[PDB]
Symmetry: C2
Subunit: 122 residues, 2 copies
């Protein structure tokens, strides 16, 4: 579920989703309504695409099972949905993390106004 | 700043903003774009109005000073902006908390689609 996606974000980035990620850029912080502004922003787009593929699932509310005991997220057993959903979440948190290098604090609460229209397809 | 608003939310509600509040209902979880669905949702509207009044301020990025050492948020000293911004944040977190009674988990990631148009004015 989003709660676990959230813990993963934090575990992986050291930043709690709000406000670092939930209000970021044009896609994370604007409901997927703008073209991602950078890597960090694109991770949310990839994240939505990933959930997009799980048509048969409730990615946002199905609680899966994972372990990050040794600092690496390992999705455990569960239904196929859970596992797939968890991979998504893992991937997105890994992605945020993998992009702390270009994370820009100034993209938080970015005016939607400078946000350009979604240009990529899942 | 939003980081402190966030800590306040958590301190007061025991729920981290993401996903409990940032994805809630029609206003918190939809960029202020829908009419609040209930109390919890309305707190975000009140929160935006409160920042709305701080035209001369950067409510989202100005770091204020507050204390919640004895379980009650006390905004400390700072610039008038900081103090006012902090009151806003306090008020919103108190509001979330004061409305855990009707908080509905099913309003998280609520489809914008059922969201009705903003009908109140600050």
């Amino acid at each position: 579920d989003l709660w676990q996606f959230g813990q993963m974000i934090l575990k992986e980035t050291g930043k709690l989703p709000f406000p670092y990620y939930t209000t970021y850029g044009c896609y994370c912080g604007w409901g997927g309504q703008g073209q991602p502004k950078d890597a960090t922003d694109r991770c949310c787009f990839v994240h939505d695409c990933c959930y997009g593929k799980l048509t048969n699932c409730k990615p946002k509310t199905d609680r899966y099972s994972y372990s990050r005991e040794n600092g690496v997220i390992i999705c455990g057993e569960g239904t196929p949905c859970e596992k797939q959903i968890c991979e998504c979440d893992k991937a997105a948190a890994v992605c945020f993390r993998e992009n702390l290098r270009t994370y820009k604090k100034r993209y938080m609460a970015y005016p939607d106004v400078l946000c350009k229209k979604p240009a990529e397809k899942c």
